[PDB]
Tab-separated table of C-alpha atoms in Angstrom:
chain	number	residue	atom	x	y	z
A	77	UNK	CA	7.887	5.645	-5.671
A	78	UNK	CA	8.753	5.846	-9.497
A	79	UNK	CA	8.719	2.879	-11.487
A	80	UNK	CA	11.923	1.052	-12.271
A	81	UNK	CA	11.570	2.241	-15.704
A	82	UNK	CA	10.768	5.853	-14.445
A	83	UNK	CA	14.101	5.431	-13.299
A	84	UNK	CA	15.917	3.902	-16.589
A	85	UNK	CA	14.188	6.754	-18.722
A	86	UNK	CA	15.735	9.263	-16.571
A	87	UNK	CA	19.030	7.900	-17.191
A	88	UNK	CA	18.275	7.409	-20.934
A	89	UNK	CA	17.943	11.264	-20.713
A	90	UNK	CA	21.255	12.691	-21.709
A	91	UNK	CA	20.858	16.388	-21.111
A	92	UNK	CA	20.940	17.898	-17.983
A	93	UNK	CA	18.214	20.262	-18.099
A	94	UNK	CA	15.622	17.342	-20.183
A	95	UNK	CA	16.101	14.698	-17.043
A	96	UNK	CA	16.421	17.073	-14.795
A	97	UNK	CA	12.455	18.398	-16.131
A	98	UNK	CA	11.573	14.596	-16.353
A	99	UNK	CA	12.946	13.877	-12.324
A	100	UNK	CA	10.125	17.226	-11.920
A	101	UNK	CA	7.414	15.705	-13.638
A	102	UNK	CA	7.827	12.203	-12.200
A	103	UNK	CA	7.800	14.078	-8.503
A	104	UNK	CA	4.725	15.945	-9.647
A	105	UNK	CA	3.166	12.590	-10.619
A	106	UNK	CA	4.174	11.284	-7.422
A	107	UNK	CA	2.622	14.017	-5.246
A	108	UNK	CA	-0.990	13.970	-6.841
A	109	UNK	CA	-0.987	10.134	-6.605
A	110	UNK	CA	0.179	10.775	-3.034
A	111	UNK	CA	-2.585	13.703	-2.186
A	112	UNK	CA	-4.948	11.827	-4.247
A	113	UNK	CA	-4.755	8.741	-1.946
A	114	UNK	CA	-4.956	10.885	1.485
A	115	UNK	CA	-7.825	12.721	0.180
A	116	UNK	CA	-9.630	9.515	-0.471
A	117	UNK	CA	-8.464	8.070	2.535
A	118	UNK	CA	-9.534	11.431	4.862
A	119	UNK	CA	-12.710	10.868	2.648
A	120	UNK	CA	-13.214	7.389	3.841
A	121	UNK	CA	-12.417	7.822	7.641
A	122	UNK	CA	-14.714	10.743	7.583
A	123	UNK	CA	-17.689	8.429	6.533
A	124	UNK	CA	-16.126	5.963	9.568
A	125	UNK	CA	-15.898	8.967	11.373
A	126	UNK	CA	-20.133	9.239	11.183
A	127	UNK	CA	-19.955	6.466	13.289
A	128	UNK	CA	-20.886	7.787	16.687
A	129	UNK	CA	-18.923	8.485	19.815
A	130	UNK	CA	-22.076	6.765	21.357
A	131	UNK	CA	-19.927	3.702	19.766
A	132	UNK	CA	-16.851	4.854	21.806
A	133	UNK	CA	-18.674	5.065	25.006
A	134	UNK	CA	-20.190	1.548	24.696
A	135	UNK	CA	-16.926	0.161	24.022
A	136	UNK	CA	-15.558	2.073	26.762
A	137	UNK	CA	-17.894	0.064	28.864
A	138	UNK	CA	-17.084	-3.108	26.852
B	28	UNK	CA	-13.554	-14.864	-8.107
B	29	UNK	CA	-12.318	-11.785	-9.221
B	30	UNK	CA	-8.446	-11.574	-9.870
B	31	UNK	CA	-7.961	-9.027	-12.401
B	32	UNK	CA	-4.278	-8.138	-12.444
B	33	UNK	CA	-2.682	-5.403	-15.024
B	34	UNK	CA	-0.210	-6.613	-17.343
B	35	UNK	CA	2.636	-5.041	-16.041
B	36	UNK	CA	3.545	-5.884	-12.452
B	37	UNK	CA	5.824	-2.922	-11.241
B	38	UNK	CA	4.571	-1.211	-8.510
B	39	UNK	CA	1.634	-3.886	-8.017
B	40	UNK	CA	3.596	-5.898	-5.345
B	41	UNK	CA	4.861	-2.645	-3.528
B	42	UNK	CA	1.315	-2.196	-1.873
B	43	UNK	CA	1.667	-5.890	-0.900
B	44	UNK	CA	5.381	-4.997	0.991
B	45	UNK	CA	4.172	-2.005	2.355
B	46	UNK	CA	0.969	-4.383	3.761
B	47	UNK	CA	3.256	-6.987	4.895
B	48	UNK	CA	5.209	-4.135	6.573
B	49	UNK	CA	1.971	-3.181	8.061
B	50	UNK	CA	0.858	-6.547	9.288
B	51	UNK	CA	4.094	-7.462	11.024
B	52	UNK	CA	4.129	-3.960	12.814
B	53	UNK	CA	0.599	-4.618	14.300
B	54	UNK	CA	1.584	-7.881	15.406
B	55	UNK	CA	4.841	-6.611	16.660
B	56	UNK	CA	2.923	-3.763	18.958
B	57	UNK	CA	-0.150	-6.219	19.459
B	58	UNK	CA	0.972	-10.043	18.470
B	59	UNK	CA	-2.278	-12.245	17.851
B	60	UNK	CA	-0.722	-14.806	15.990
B	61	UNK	CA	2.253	-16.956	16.300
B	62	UNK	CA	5.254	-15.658	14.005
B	63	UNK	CA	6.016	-19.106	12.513
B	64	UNK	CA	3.804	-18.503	9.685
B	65	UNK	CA	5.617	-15.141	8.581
B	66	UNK	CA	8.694	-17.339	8.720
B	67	UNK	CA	7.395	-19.850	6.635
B	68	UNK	CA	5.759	-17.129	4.123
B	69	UNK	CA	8.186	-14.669	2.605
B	70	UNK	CA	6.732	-12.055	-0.218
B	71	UNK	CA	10.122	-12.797	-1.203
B	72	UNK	CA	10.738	-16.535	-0.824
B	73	UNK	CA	8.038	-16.955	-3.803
B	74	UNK	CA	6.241	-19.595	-2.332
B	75	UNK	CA	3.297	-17.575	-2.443
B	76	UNK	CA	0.979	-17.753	-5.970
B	77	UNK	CA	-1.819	-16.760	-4.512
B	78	UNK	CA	-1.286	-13.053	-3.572
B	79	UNK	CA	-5.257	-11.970	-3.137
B	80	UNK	CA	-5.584	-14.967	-0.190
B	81	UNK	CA	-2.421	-13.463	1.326
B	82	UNK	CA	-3.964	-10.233	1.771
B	83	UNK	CA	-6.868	-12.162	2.837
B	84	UNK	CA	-4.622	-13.524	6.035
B	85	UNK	CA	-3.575	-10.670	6.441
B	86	UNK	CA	-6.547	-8.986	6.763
B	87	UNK	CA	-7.835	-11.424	8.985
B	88	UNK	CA	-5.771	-10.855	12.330
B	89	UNK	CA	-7.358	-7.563	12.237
């Protein structure tokens, strides 16, 4: 999900081993944004979550 | 009203496609309102300057 100009730097990047580092970092930057926003989101359903399964009864019966 | 909006737009409006994505999947699997108005309303037609009360629509078939 790089940025457009992520992807323009990368090609600025004339060596093979110095874009080929950058394409590494910009996945690494990728992947904690990515685990960041799952942990937040587990985080989040989890305090849904203390909503009770009294809840899911009654709207069983709903 | 609160609008705040960083000065560069780059990966802004990709949480708005992947909630448009979102919205017409629900409403494909569980339709509660006619699809006319996603017709009329494209993210990319333009038409729309106020992105905040689109997420606000969107947020309200829920």
């Amino acid at each position: 999900g790089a940025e457009s100009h992520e992807l323009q730097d990368v090609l600025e990047e004339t060596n093979i081993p110095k874009r080929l580092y950058k394409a590494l970092s910009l996945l690494k930057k990728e992947f904690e944004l990515s685990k960041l926003q799952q942990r937040l989101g587990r985080e989040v359903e989890e305090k849904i979550k203390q909503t009770h399964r009294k809840f899911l009864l009654q709207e069983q019966l709903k | 009203v609160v609008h705040e909006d960083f000065q560069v737009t780059e990966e802004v409006k990709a949480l708005t496609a992947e909630i448009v994505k979102t919205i017409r999947d629900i409403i494909a699997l569980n339709p509660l309102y006619r699809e006319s108005v996603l017709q009329m309303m494209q993210a990319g037609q333009r038409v729309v300057d106020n992105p905040i009360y689109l997420s606000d629509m969107g947020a309200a078939l829920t």
